[PDB]
Design a protein around this nucleic acid. Structure first.
Ligand SMILES: [Mg+2]
Ligand SMILES: [Zn+2]
Ligand SMILES: [Zn+2]
Ligand SMILES: [Zn+2]
Ligand SMILES: [Zn+2]
Ligand SMILES: [Zn+2]
Ligand SMILES: [Zn+2]
Lengths: 261, 299, 97, 68, 185, 48, 157, 95
RNA sequence: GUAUGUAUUUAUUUU
RNA sequence: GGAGGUCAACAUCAAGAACUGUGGGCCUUUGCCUAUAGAACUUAUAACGAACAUGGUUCUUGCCUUUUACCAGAAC
């Protein structure tokens, strides 16, 4: 309220500043129809985003608010949006009210207004499924921190918690020491989508620590859709949750069914 | 509703009717006005409101980024000019064997520094120490207390720069070397010989330097050049300018070494007089003094 | 041409343009002729480029006289993928004129 | 209904093509599809262009173009 | 003919409160998000002025078999996600009625064409150190509860949660199932 | 030449003036009727 | 007939010179409109076009005020302009019509182009859209006619 | 003539020599070792030279267990393995 | 009428 | 209300040397006979165009290893 509601959203990036298109020299010659490169295959093309967002700093009111639009600017989720207050889409972190508005249409399509596909993807790629609500993001490629070794996993755990913690209400977080992955779980599908698009290809530690000013040479961390949890515990936990919630909506079924007579 | 209500009501829209709302490089400008050549250019480090431009006529003409004022007082051509950050001072230096201070407030010479053997072709103002670094045909670098003499290159010293950490002075000479100096001990920290005279350097605003030669512009913690023979300036966007004596303006990317543009200036109303003597960027614009007696502003 | 007449086509009254201008997507203006010539050349060149790369061939270069030349010596499967028919080539020659 | 066509400044066209000269963007995914389509109607445009040649005695003919 | 003649299936919910609605009909649209075959597409807008546009995703067949809504993809009657209604149904009886679906392509491209229906369809820095925590509850619950009464880490293998307020003074405030204790240096 | 892109009409050509065409000297006396409009683009546009 | 100086073009009438500076400021701006300032975003592109359309409107509005308001020039200067394409004949003719005095364009009143109905919301007075807005209390979502950049052609606003 | 000829022609090479100077192409699927390790250059490069080894480690590693029965052959191939794995060690050591 | 085919995993899915 | 428009839509343009409407009589509506009114545009060295292209099938050839691409006549 006092933070976001009043203060209008501010331009993240000047339009001239936006990165060029035409990704660099993945191949021999440039190609006009597809935007790719022609012959040969250069070492796989990935790079950290020069950009990141600042939830309380940037986010503010925009034109969609007065126009009552449902869907969020992803170039805001990337903090790259150059349209500022003129933007057609909302700039702010998803709350429970707005998901309240989306609740009817969140089934087929993500919070950014893109239809979901059926199968997920071979590698668990960009957008998820409309079959199964999946609230759990796989965080991987923790080498987004580049090569800095840390005193304990409480560095990774703590830092990630303070990263995604801004983006929405977190149900749980587990970093794994053995195999480098975080598993982050949210109240709402919407925050999961938004966080996924927001934190993909990002860096870590402090606005300045050590190698910070070299950060742009890093690879950036994969944020992908996560499979189920194999251990018996959380599997019990899912089975139970599904049970009680099914029970909860049976109340609706018998209320409107009772109204049916 | 009523006519009066509407007529009054509309003027609310910002701009009449009906659009009124409810609720590469190229050559921008040519500035004549020097009588002689333009040797050196520097820009107000704070407000970007003006130039200080040397000349071959001994004067200095302070241009608005119109001509504000004229600063006379050198008897011979002015090879170098440098403006101070923390100070309202302007250090100009010439072929007359003297480094003259200038108090920007009242516009009168304050101090004269003494003891160069011959013409002094570079001044650079150390950022944090209240020092001056001067150099010239002496073949030595003099650190002036606004103290140290640096024995050194085997020939004249064209271009000198200052850096806050180690090496605090980078120097470039007609013996075709570039030395990285350690001033406290007063001797060369590192020598860079890869140049085959190094007539210009520029400091990237990455902690590196771009060094020049006839046909090959290198960098130092390469740049593709066919013969450009024979100044450099580094934009904050990592664009690396190269002025030619053939009149060609060779723009580079700093990261790669790639040359994405080469231009050709129009001489003036001799084909030999077309070249680029100095150049600078503001604190998105380019300012190049040319040998044709004109300053040009490239946008 | 006198011996074999034609007697064209009633109901032909519908013309390409009279059908075309109807839609939202075409707008009318005046202009210098040579300018229309140049625009149309630029049009064509973009068309044939997008059709060439869309097929996946990036090593056939069009110059600005509409000569189509390989930029490389071609492996055999290139020559097979890259055989362009009389549609393309014919239209290429025509624009070249 | 049927109000006839709306004639426009030439500058407009000049800006449209002027813009599409360089296209690398994703926003052109339709326009690219749009180009190939028009490839069918070009030789017609070649005809209509070429029969309008200005002839020697005239300096510059001025025509009505219909553009996409 | 075959594609047009079956009329669309739309919920009354997402179709909006407007009395009369104008919708667009395209004879060949995108394929289903399911069957991967062409069909006829329908735009519309709930409101006359509503910015948002509604686009039927799946077929008529690929819907009818599953008895759902083409815009929503919720069950035609109960307004339920498909993966749920078959779970409620499966609670009655014992083990059945799960909808087994179509991997690969011509598996599904095949499957949508049979008239069999599908099983669900067929019927229709101050650290407090926290202990005693059920593994099950989410952090979101806890903090929300604290907020209701009047920033956080948890470890779920541990069952131990730490809490740093923005001021011990909050500490006193809140101090106006748990193991609390107040310590940090 | 093949490497020169087609020069943009909105820059080079539009400024440069037409450089007078063929026509003919005609005659003043004999052609006095037809000398005026003979070479117009469309020979007679405004006439009732 | 053509914009160009082609020898068949009849020389300027008398009153021309006095208005030549005022027109030049328009010309030199259209030169800057086509120069192809590149942008990635669609909104910025059709914004670039909106510039051109609005400029054209302003110029023809200048001439319209000259001849049909102040009568500041001769009829022959005027007709010579129209034949030289300094003004838009049809557009002015719409301005002389009753309720069109402020009109955008010739597109905005096209009945055929638009999908259903006609006549861009670009033509509907703010005073009303505020009222139908009031029914919803959602305020009003309209900003610019996508063809033009208009806000409220209709001559009340 | 087999494409071995057609891929090595000047008109193929020259664009590679432009792509090195203008961008990040030049493969490393082409060149060989380079024989000496310490003579290699900035890490982002030896990084790719190293995978340019590990891949062959994978190919011939799979080529070990194969029943195809040539024991002398798998002997020399076994020595080739050891050689390469030592190279891998060397590239790691330099890093 | 200058074949053709197979493989080319780098970023580590909860016990 | 007049003049126009490089505007649109809908009609009509190859036939018993040929169109349409209407009055009357016979057969039993059609059709035949008789009477009457109006006929724009296109036609006799025949046709809307005082001009002039391409394609498909089928035959006859011509080049001639085979297919596209073709050689020059005819019919539809
Ligand atoms: Mg055969
Ligand atoms: Zn935005
Ligand atoms: Zn389907
Ligand atoms: Zn629905
Ligand atoms: Zn308009
Ligand atoms: Zn409009
Ligand atoms: Zn308008």
């Amino acid at each position: 309220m006092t933070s976001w509601r009043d203060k209008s959203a501010k331009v993240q990036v000047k339009e001239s500043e936006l990165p060029s298109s035409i990704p660099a020299q993945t191949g021999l010659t440039f190609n006009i129809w597809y935007n790719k490169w022609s012959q040969g295959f250069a070492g796989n093309t990935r790079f950290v985003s020069p950009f990141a967002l600042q939830p309380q700093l940037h986010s503010g009111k925009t034109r969609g608010d007065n126009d009552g639009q449902l869907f969020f600017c992803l170039f805001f989720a990337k903090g790259m949006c150059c349209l500022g207050p003129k933007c057609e889409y909302l700039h702010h972190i998803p709350d429970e009210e707005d998901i309240g508005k989306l609740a009817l249409r969140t089934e087929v399509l993500d919070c950014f207004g893109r239809e979901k596909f059926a199968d997920y993807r071979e590698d668990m790629g960009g957008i998820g499924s409309f079959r199964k609500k999946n609230k759990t993001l796989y965080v991987g490629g923790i080498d987004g921190a580049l090569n800095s070794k840390h005193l304990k996993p409480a560095q990774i755990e703590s830092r990630i918690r303070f990263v995604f913690s801004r983006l929405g209400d977190i149900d749980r977080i587990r970093y794994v020491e053995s195999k480098n992955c975080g598993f982050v779980k949210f109240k709402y599908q919407a925050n999961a989508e938004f966080a996924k698009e927001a934190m993909s290809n990002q860096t870590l530690l402090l606005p300045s620590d050590k190698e910070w000013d070299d950060r742009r040479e890093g690879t950036g961390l994969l944020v992908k859709w996560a499979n189920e949890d194999p251990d018996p515990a959380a599997q019990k936990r899912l089975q139970e949750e599904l049970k009680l919630e099914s029970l909860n909506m049976m109340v609706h079924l018998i209320n409107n069914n009772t109204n049916s007579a | 509703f009523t006519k009066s209500e509407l007529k009054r009501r509309r003027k609310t829209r910002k701009g009449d009717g009906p659009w009124g709302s409810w609720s590469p490089k190229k050559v921008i400008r040519n500035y004549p006005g020097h009588p002689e050549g333009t040797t050196a250019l520097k820009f107000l480090p704070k407000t970007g409101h003006l130039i200080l431009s040397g000349g071959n006529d001994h004067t200095i003409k302070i241009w608005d980024f119109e001509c504000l004022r004229d600063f006379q007082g050198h008897n011979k051509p002015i090879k170098a000019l440098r403006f101070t950050e923390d100070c309202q001072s302007f250090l100009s230096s010439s072929f007359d064997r003297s480094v003259k201070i200038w108090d920007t407030e009242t516009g009168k010479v304050k101090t004269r520094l003494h003891l160069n053997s011959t013409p002094a072709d570079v001044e650079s103002r150390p950022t944090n120490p209240h020092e001056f670094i001067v150099g010239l045909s002496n073949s030595k670098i003099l650190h002036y207390d606004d103290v140290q003499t640096y024995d050194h290159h085997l020939s004249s010293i064209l271009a000198l720069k200052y850096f806050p950490d180690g090496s605090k002075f980078i120097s470039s000479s007609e013996d075709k070397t570039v030395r990285i100096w350690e001033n406290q001990i007063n001797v060369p920290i590192k020598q860079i010989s890869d140049t085959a005279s190094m007539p210009f350097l520029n400091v990237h605003p990455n902690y590196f330097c771009a060094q020049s030669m006839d046909n090959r512009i290198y960098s130092f913690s390469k740049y593709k050049r066919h013969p450009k023979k024979i100044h450099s300036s580094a934009g904050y966007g990592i664009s690396l300018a190269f002025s030619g004596d053939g009149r060609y303006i060779c723009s580079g990317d700093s990261k790669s070494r790639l040359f994405t543009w080469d231009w050709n200036t129009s001489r003036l109303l001799i084909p030999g007089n077309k070249p680029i003597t100095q150049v600078d960027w503001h604190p998105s614009k380019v300012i190049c003094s040319g040998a044709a007696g004109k300053i040009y502003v490239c946008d | 041409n006198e011996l074999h007449p034609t007697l064209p086509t009633n109901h032909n009254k519908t013309k390409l343009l009279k059908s075309l201008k109807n839609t939202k997507y075409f707008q009318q203006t005046t202009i210098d002729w040579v300018e229309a010539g140049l625009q149309l050349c630029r049009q064509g060149h973009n068309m044939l480029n997008l059709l060439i790369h869309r097929k996946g061939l990036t090593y056939l270069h069009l110059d600005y006289n509409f000569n189509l030349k390989p930029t490389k010596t071609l492996t055999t499967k290139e020559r097979k993928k890259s055989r362009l028919g009389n549609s393309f080539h014919l239209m290429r020659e025509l624009l070249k004129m | 209904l049927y109000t006839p066509k709306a004639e426009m400044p030439p500058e407009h066209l000049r800006k449209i093509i002027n813009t599409h000269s360089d296209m690398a963007s994703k926003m052109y995914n339709t326009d690219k599809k749009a180009f190939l389509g028009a490839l069918k109607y070009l030789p017609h445009a070649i005809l209509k262009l070429l029969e309008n040649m200005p002839h020697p005695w005239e300096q510059a003919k001025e025509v009505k173009v219909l553009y996409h | 003919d075959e594609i047009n003649e079956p009329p669309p299936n739309i919920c009354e919910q997402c179709l909006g409160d407007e009395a009369n609605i104008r919708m667009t009909k395209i004879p060949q649209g995108s394929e289903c998000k399911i069957c991967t075959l062409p069909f006829t597409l329908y735009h519309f807008k709930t409101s006359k002025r509503s910015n948002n546009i509604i686009k039927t995703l799946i077929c008529v067949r690929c819907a009818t078999q599953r008895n759902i809504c083409q815009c929503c993809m919720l069950d035609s009657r109960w307004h339920i996600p498909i993966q749920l209604r078959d779970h409620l149904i499966s609670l009655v009886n014992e083990e059945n009625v799960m909808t087994e679906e179509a991997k690969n392509d011509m598996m599904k491209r095949f499957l949508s064409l049979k008239n069999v229906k599908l099983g669900g369809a067929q019927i229709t820095t101050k650290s407090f150190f926290l202990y005693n925590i059920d593994a099950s509850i989410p952090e979101w619950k806890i903090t929300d509860t604290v907020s209701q009464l009047l920033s956080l880490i948890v470890n779920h293998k541990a069952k131990c949660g730490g809490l740093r307020f923005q001021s011990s003074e909050l500490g006193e405030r809140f101090v106006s199932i748990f193991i609390i204790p107040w310590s940090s240096g | 030449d093949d490497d020169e892109p087609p020069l943009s009409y909105e820059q080079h050509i539009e400024n440069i003036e037409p450089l007078d065409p063929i026509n003919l000297p005609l005659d003043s006396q004999d052609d006095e009727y037809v000398k005026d409009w003979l070479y117009d683009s469309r020979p007679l546009e405004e006439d009732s | 007939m053509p914009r160009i100086k082609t020898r068949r073009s009849k020389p300027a009438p008398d009153g021309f010179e006095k208005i030549k500076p005022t027109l030049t400021d328009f010309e030199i701006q259209l030169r800057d409109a086509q120069k192809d300032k590149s942008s990635k975003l669609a909104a910025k592109s059709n914004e670039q076009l909106w510039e051109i359309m609005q400029l054209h409107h302003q110029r023809s509005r200048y001439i319209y005020t000259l001849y049909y308001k102040r009568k500041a020039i001769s009829k022959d200067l005027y007709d010579w302009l129209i034949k030289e394409k300094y003004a838009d004949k049809l557009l002015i003719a719409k301005w002389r019509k009753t309720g069109y005095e402020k009109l955008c364009c010739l597109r905005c009143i096209q009945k055929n182009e638009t999908n259903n109905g006609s006549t861009c919301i670009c033509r509907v007075p703010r005073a009303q859209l505020e009222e139908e807005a009031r029914k919803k209390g959602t305020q009003v979502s309209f900003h610019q006619c996508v063809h033009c950049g208009c806000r409220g052609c209709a001559s009340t606003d | 003539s087999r494409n071995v000829d057609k891929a090595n022609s000047v008109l193929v090479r020259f664009q590679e020599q432009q792509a090195e100077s203008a961008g990040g192409y030049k493969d490393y699927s082409r060149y060989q070792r380079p024989r000496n390790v310490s003579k290699v250059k900035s890490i982002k490069e030896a990084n790719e030279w190293k995978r340019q080894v590990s891949k062959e480690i994978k190919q011939k590693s799979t080529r070990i267990y194969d029943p195809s029965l040539n024991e002398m052959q798998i002997a020399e191939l076994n020595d080739e393995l050891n050689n390469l794995f030592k190279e891998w060690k060397r590239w790691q050591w330099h890093i």
